[PDB]
Amino acid sequence: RAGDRIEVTGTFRSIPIRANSRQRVLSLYKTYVDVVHVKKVVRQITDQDLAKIREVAAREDLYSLLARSIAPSIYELEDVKKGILLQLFGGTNKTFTKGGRYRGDINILLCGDPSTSKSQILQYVHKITPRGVYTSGKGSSAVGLTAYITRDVDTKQLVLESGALVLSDGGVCCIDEFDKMSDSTRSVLHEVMEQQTISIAKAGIITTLNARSSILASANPI
Amino acid sequence: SILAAANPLYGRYNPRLSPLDNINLPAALLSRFDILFLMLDIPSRDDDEKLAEHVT
DNA sequence: ATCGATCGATC
DNA sequence: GATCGATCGATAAAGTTTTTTTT
C-alpha cells in the first residue's frame, strides 16, 4: 500500500519516449527500475496463550494486575484506570431481532488539571489497539471529516472517503479539544451517539451508513 | 527547539494591566512552555545616554 | 514541414 | 493486375488575478 517506509531490490532499465504524440520521432531518456523483491523494513490463535491467560484468569487480582500493568511510568491514580480498560473491554453488540438494537458500548470522559499525561495516556491507548484513530488540531473539520467533493490530481472526479468516526470500525475513537471545537461541527457526534450513523447531505448522493464506534473525551479547562 | 518572540498588542504593554492581553494561546504557556523573558522599557537618565552613545 | 495515403502509370 | 512513385492533404499550441455571494 502507498505511504510506508520501503526497501526494494531492483534491477535497472531505460526506455525511449516519443516527443510528438503522432510521429515516430523520439531523446533525453527516462529511466525506471524493475523490482524483483520488496521489503517494508483473524489472528493465528494458538493454545499456549489461552493456557497462559487461564493461569492469570485463575488469579483473582487480575483487575489489580491490569491496574498496575497499564502504567509503566504514570502515578497510581486507581480511579481513572478502572474505566479505561473497561472501555477497551468494549462489551458486545447485544442485538435483538425485533426491537431494541442496543449496543453495550459506553463513553467515559476526563477533564481537569492541564498536562497530567492527558495526551500520553491517549497515546498509550493508541498503542494497545492496532486499528484505531487519532484526532488532530483541525486536521478534520465539519466538512473536512466526511462528505467530500475533492478534485483529485489523478482524475478530477468524485471520491467519498470516510471520516474518522466511521474509520474506527473495530477500535476506540480517541478525540480531544472539546472546548475549542467549532460549533459548526460538535453537532453530528450526537447522531453517532444516538443512531450510530452519519447522515450525508452532499451534492453527490444520500447514504445512511452506520458507524460501529466507541468514544472517549479529553476536555480542557478554560 | 522553538524560539518565539510574540510582539505585544497596541501601545506599550500596560504592566498595571493583566498579562495574556496580547499573547494568544494560554494552553501553550501553562505547561507546553517552560520559561519566559521580557523587554520592558523604563526612562532612565544614566543608562539611555550610554544607549544613545551605543547607537551614535 | 513531414509523413501517410491514395491514385495513376508502367511493366 | 500489381507495384512503385509522386502528389496532396492533414497534423503538431497554452491557462490560473478580478469579482460574486456566503459563513
Would you give an account of this structure?
In chain A, a hairpin with a 4-residue loop joins β5 and β6. Chain A is α/β, with parallel strands linked by helices and 222 residues long. Chain A starts with 6 loop residues before the first strand and ends with a strand. The longest helix of chain A has 11 residues. Chain A has a three-stranded parallel sheet, with helices on one face. A two-stranded antiparallel ribbon of chain A has the order 1-2. A two-stranded antiparallel sheet of chain A has the order 5-6. Chain B has 56 residues and is mainly alpha-helical. Chain B is elongated. At the A-B interface, loops of A face loops of B.
What labels would you give this structure?
part of a larger assembly, 2 chains, A: 222 residues, alpha/beta, three-stranded parallel β-sheet, two-stranded antiparallel sheet, B: 56 residues, mainly alpha, elongated, DNA-binding, DNA replication licensing factor MCM7 (chain B), DNA replication licensing factor MCM4 (chain A)
